[PDB]
Amino acid sequence: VVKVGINGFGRIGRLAFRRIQNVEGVEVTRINDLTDPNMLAHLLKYDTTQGRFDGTVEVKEGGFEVNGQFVKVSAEREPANIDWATDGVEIVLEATGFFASKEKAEQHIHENGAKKVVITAPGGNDVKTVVFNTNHDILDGTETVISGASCTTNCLAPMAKALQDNFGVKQGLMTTIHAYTGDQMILDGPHRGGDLRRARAGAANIVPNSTGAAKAIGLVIPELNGKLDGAAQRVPVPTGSVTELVATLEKDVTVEEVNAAMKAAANDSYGYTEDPIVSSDIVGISYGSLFDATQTKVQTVDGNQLVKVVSWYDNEMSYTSQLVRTLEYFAKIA
Amino acid sequence: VVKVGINGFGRIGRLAFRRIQNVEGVEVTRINDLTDPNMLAHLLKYDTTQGRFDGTVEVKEGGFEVNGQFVKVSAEREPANIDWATDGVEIVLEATGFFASKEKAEQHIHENGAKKVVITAPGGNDVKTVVFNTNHDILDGTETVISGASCTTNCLAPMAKALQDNFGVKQGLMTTIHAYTGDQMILDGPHRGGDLRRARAGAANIVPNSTGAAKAIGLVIPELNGKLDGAAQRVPVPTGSVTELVATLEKDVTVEEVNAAMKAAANDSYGYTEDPIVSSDIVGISYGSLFDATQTKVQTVDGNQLVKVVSWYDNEMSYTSQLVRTLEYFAKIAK
Amino acid sequence: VKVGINGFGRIGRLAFRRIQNVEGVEVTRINDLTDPNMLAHLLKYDTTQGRFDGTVEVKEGGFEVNGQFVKVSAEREPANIDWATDGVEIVLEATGFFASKEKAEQHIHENGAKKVVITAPGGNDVKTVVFNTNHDILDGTETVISGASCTTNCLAPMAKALQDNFGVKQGLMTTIHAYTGDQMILDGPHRGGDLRRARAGAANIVPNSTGAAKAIGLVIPELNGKLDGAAQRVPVPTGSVTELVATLEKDVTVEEVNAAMKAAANDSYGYTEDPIVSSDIVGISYGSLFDATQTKVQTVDGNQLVKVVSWYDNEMSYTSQLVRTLEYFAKIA
Amino acid sequence: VKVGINGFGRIGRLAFRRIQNVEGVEVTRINDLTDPNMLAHLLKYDTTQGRFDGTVEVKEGGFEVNGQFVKVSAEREPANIDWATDGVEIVLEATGFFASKEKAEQHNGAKKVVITAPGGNDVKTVVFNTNHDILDGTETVISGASCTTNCLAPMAKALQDNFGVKQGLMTTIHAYTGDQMILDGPHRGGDLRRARAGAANIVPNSTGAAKAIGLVIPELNGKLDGAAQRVPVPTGSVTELVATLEKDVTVEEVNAAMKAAANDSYGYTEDPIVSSDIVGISYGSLFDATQTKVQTVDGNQLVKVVSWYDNEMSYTSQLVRTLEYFAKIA
Ligand SMILES: NC(=O)c1ccc[n+]([C@@H]2O[C@H](COP(=O)([O-])OP(=O)(O)OC[C@H]3O[C@@H](n4cnc5c(N)ncnc54)[C@H](O)[C@@H]3O)[C@@H](O)[C@H]2O)c1
Ligand SMILES: NC(=O)c1ccc[n+]([C@@H]2O[C@H](COP(=O)([O-])OP(=O)(O)OC[C@H]3O[C@@H](n4cnc5c(N)ncnc54)[C@H](O)[C@@H]3O)[C@@H](O)[C@H]2O)c1
Ligand SMILES: NC(=O)c1ccc[n+]([C@@H]2O[C@H](COP(=O)([O-])OP(=O)(O)OC[C@H]3O[C@@H](n4cnc5c(N)ncnc54)[C@H](O)[C@@H]3O)[C@@H](O)[C@H]2O)c1
Ligand SMILES: NC(=O)c1ccc[n+]([C@@H]2O[C@H](COP(=O)([O-])OP(=O)(O)OC[C@H]3O[C@@H](n4cnc5c(N)ncnc54)[C@H](O)[C@@H]3O)[C@@H](O)[C@H]2O)c1
Ligand SMILES: [Mg+2]
Ligand SMILES: [Mg+2]
Ligand SMILES: [Mg+2]
Ligand SMILES: [Mg+2]
């Protein structure tokens, strides 16, 4: 049983905690955030988009009990000052959004701190970046800091990989139509990151925004390095997203071939569907990516093809499911 | 002064009426819908997304007065039974969504009916389809039924045209991230048109849906016939939309060239901006299409280019502005 | 007991879902205005209530749910539905269009159904049941009964508890309520002539009428004529809350009021002290969930106004009550 | 009179907009926590209140509005803002963080401060056209009260003057605001409800408006209490008051009394409007006669009265009325 610590008990932190309850041999013994146990316990119990917690939660001194079992809560602002080892913690899920680099994540690793760190976000080009079931084979267990990549990367990767392996990808442009997130303002106001679009009311607008997922795909699928770019449209749903990829391929294809190739690539991480679903239908799913064969296009004009492939993801639970798969596997080979 | 009738006093019908108040050559003397004048007057006065009506509205017997001037209201379900001529109406705006074809729209044209019809939607391949300032020159005035095209078509057309004229378009795929509309269900329920996605709660989902705008662009820009296809993602804003086009071109280009070409093509119908705006910023605009230079991409990989161009539109007011431009012009030249 | 659903809508579909976990009641026929593919899809996927717990496969003239076939018809007139063909004794009338004794009775003819449960208020000549508040008024001989409204099932146990413990003189109710299918998605002509329900339901606070308080006498006779109220419809797709401001026959404290509600708690009436919000009550099985955090007792110059507040999922809370009433009725029929 | 804005937020920016159409009041300095580009962009484009009516051009250390330069600073501490450099006599304190006499007084600084929120019991609290007569101009710190107080006050006052109020309970069905989280997360103020996704929930929350009404209408002191239900609209609110009165009344009498009390601050309507219809209005409070109830049971009456307000523009309109008047008598 590997003992895990969560830094940043936010959307990803709390959902990771929920999934970990059904993973034998991984257990959370410590949570660090910037608030009291009552706030954190309440947010675990009740969840607007992901439903009521499946179990009991009872606030205690310095923490809370989940199904009888105590979990320590601290409010330490600096990772360097978190004494993870006190609670037996070997691996930290770094889920704050503020320490997503090798140098900053490593602050968790000190005397009486943690041994290893999994960043719940892109962590820079000097940190191994893992999409479970696409490139988790790059791990040997000696790594001190790893990255679970982004929500959009975990969605895009198996879809793009399948295209590459089957047909060959020349280039592609991606658009993600994406749920609003906590880095957007609830109402028009000064954005601390200087983004004039994330400054705007997130639940009342279509909001264009940048994403590096397509550009950084090379870190996950080397052979696609430099081939993909993209962007996002943030829209008023509180969770649930979809990724469209328009690509040129090395082989002529049909819609049926493309869909069949995706179905053949399906596994625990990459789902396949032919039902005409909408975003609420993918909230809480455990696939990292859910290919939607109903949205496939292959456009042939004067012998030239553009291919459109589309995959759903719950930017919350889909990512978290992938994250916990990567955490479990990493813990077992550490 | 050409007298106009509105069939379907809905989102497009009511907004068209609003714009017509500031058009000298044209006036609405009759509205036909499926309800009483009180309902229609209230909906004209108060508008969730487009604001309070600029003027006075007072309910009367068989109609209502707008700034003193009476407008007749009928509730006739069948276009054949609407006596448009009684109120001097020559041209009907067919805005119900139920008579969007040549055969069905022509029902307005009978003895004591109207002379001509403008469909506020695609109207089939046998009806001239107009995007104002892109192909309104195809009109000679002898037409009995014309189409103002769709919201997405009026957005896409000047953007695509500019790409064609400057660089040449080989092919392209379009996605419109689009406001929910009245053909979607407020909550999950049986959809009358058999669409399993429009059956879903429109203000609580990202909803994929089909659109023929890209496929039917040939009707507006003949040289793009067969070159474009696309689809929609309907999302929870009550109005305001954006169209992304990913295309291959006949010339190698840069981002700066593409943006400069759009700016050079700008007019009353096609706007240009470099401000990082969001959808609420385009609600109520009078451009049919507002090109956003901040979203342009030109991706070069192994010498091959994909070009991404993006334009905003208020599916309500942008379209309506184009519609009324087309109506005004058509009314001037009508024979 | 074999059951038929007329109107496979929000309440119809959710009732079907709950019935899967009720032994001895089963749905053998659905009637609506569409094809089986539309209905099966809507059962499988649900924006506010989640993916269906089971398998659904479309067939000719119906669909299979966990292997078991359910017939689908598209008959517009209740008189023309041959319920008896599929063994149906009791019809859930869930369309919203036949909510009266005379209209509901159209289901009852020779190869039709025997009995009808209207999923809405059904008039003063139809017994109106809020399960665990007045289901004892049923003897099983009734041909048409009413499961009341969402707001009535929320209000009733809360008001009853006030009456039994302290005595109610009078009260005014406000329900802050999810938007529903009778509102327009965007501003447009409303078929019922309501100038407020004509407005975009997911983009406005929309005042609207409700008869729940006024009709409470049908459920709790001793409160007849004592309560009135209204609604504010707001942009959540499901989930509602009922506030009642009342004068009572006894002086009280906040703690007494809350303790009385807790003592009245059962399968239909829940009690909570957690500061929850509407998403937390989506899908609950209580008809009414009293929220002790929102209680007020205001004393000014010796006079008291008492505020009590209860949550309800206008969808699942009501449906849970409806199916409790259906199950019980079916047992004693 | 030259004015400074501390906190260029929803109220700050909207106050700036209204001030453009007030002769003899002018904003020469803005202080916030960001660069001029961010502030200029937020002035230009507004999700709920529309595009700015004029030109805005970013400059070094500020921006130009219709040609006229406005200085922007990013000073976190009010004590360190050199307001006097830009001629500023009166500061609109609109951050939400300095809403007390001691904290507001921290403002070569300014002479006087108007807090855009309740400011404590030792600060004069003004609802324009209800109690602005309490000002003599010698005050250093004043309060424009809250959005809900400006809505409730003229409605309650009218009830008191006409019929007499014994007691009442208020519910405001209120737009979500910036103090709520966009998605479920730790709330810095310790509020377990404001922690929740504001645009995806009905969220109960406290409000002191009813309890503090005594500061505006002394004769109602101790008579009113209430609470809020925050709901998913980005602006626009409504206040319901259920009250017992000293006189027996009818619905028609109550409505007629409200109509008779109508002025620039207190509007009257009989149209069955919804919240989008009141976005951007200039009334502090808009009485809705369609929602009135008078319930008589065994000779005893409960009276329900309801008024709309744009928590943003209705409040701001009142705030700028109070600012203008205060500036003139200072
Ligand atoms: N939400 C998503 O869709 C999503 C998907 C994939 C990846 N991510 C990534 O996960 C990370 C967190 O995102 P989120 O959506 O959960 O954010 P969130 O705001 O919900 O949660 C962040 C949490 O971190 C806490 N925090 C902030 N600073 C801290 C500090 N110094 N010490 C301890 N705790 C601190 C906050 O109090 C908060 O509880 C980010 O890196 C984000 O990019 C998010
Ligand atoms: N809303 C948009 O974004 C948009 C944009 C471009 C084009 N359009 C098109 O405009 C048309 C109307 O769209 P809308 O969004 O205004 O719809 P809407 O539903 O708001 O209005 C349609 C109106 O027609 C009325 N109606 C229905 N059947 C009728 C009949 N038989 N006779 C008379 N009136 C009848 C209804 O009462 C309703 O008021 C459609 O063809 C639509 O595709 C809409
Ligand atoms: N949604 C709620 O919160 C709620 C709560 C309590 C009670 N109710 C009541 O339940 C009833 C239905 O409400 P809903 O929200 O489920 O409505 P809904 O619109 O979701 O469902 C109504 C269904 O009836 C069908 N229908 C309409 N006319 C028909 C006909 N002639 N024959 C057969 N089917 C027909 C429609 O196709 C639709 O599927 C109403 O009486 C309503 O007041 C609703
Ligand atoms: N929005 C409403 O409906 C409403 C109505 C009435 C009153 N108010 C009150 O107005 C005040 C502001 O409310 P808002 O909704 O505009 O908030 P907001 O968050 O929109 O604006 C606050 C602004 O102040 C800035 N700020 C924060 N700390 C600062 C500091 N130390 N120095 C300088 N600037 C700082 C922020 O960057 C932001 O631009 C609060 O007191 C609030 O209670 C709000
Ligand atoms: Mg475990
Ligand atoms: Mg005119
Ligand atoms: Mg069963
Ligand atoms: Mg001025």
Numbering used by the authors:
A (entry chain A): 2 to 335
B (entry chain B): 2 to 336
C (entry chain D): 3 to 335
D (entry chain C): 3 to 109, 113 to 335
The authors write:
In addition, we have determined the structure in the holo-form using a new data set extending to a resolution of 2.0 Å. In the holo enzyme all four subunits have NAD+ bound in the active site while in the mixed-holo complex only two subunits contain NAD+. Two conserved water molecules bridge the cofactor pyrophosphate and the glycine-rich loop in the active site of all four subunits in the holo complex as described for hGAPDH. In the apo-enzyme structure the distance between Cys152 SG and His179 NE2 in different subunits varies in the range 4.0–4.2 Å. In the holo-enzyme and the ternary complex each subunit contains a bound NAD+ molecule and rmsd between the individual subunits are in the range of 0.06–0.14 Å and 0.09–0.26 Å, respectively. Upon cofactor binding GAPDH undergoes substantial conformational changes. These changes lead to stabilization of the protein structure as is reflected in a significantly lower average B-factor for the holo-complex (29.7 Å2) as compared to the apo-form (60 Å2) and the mixed-holo form (60.8 Å2). In the holo complex 45% of the accessible surface area is buried in comparison to 33% in the apo structure. In the holo-enzyme Arg235 forms a salt bridge with Asp184 and hydrogen bonds with the side chains of Thr182 and Gln185.
GAPDH plays a key role in glycolysis and gluconeogenesis by catalyzing the reversible oxidative phosphorylation of D-glyceraldehyde 3-phosphate (D-G3H) to the energy-rich intermediate glyceraldehyde 1,3-bisphosphate (1,3-BPG). Recent studies suggest that GBS GAPDH is a major virulence factor and a potential vaccine candidate. Each GAPDH subunit is composed of two domains, and consists of 13 helices and 2 β-sheets of 9 and 8 strands.
